[PDB]
């Protein structure tokens, strides 16, 4: 599962 909602966490 690739959760769009987790993307900014990865980038932070």
């Amino acid at each position: 599962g690739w959760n769009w909602f987790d993307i900014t966490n990865w980038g932070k």
Partner: antibody
Amino acid sequence: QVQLVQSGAEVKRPGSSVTVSCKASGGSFSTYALSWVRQAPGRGLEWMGGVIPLLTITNYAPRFQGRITITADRSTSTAYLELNSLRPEDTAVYYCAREGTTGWGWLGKPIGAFAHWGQGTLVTVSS
Amino acid sequence: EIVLTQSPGTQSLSPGERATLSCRASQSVGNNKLAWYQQRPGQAPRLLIYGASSRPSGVADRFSGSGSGTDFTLTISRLEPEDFAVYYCQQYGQSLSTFGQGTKVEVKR
């Protein structure tokens, strides 16, 4: 401190397209997810979609895929929601909302959930 | 699409009473990404709980969230006058985020 300011209420004719803006100040515009949520009169909240500015990553709800465009202008910290082919049922208050963060300040770890909300924009679809 | 069911849709309770609101998911919520919001007439929604149990700084500690998987609960230890409003749960454990239809907590008299 994060404050989201939306454009004023607007009357739109059926079939037209509406554009609602949301200007942010504080925290970081580019690295936090910005979503749009609407609420028709007397009804519940509905997530329409969102955008992560830094890489122009959009994510739309299937129900609006084909009628919606969400864009972010990093030079003005402004996000935009465009909804086409308006019908009376699109009459509602539209809110932009940015993801919250943990810890002091407003540059901590993103929490996904919507902590910052604009004042909303009433869009009235009518002739 | 994950359907979030909030039942009952209305709870008539007395000031100072305890309150438990149920939010059931049609399927498992990814990483317990369940959030709760409060909304009063004329105002924009306000985040109360995220990650099923985390409460952001500023939110009264009388609000607490519990549960995981498909069964979540928002608990209000005691109802203050300003707590009578509408409550929505939301799941964002996958790209397509959804809200429940909301539960209105009103004053019983």
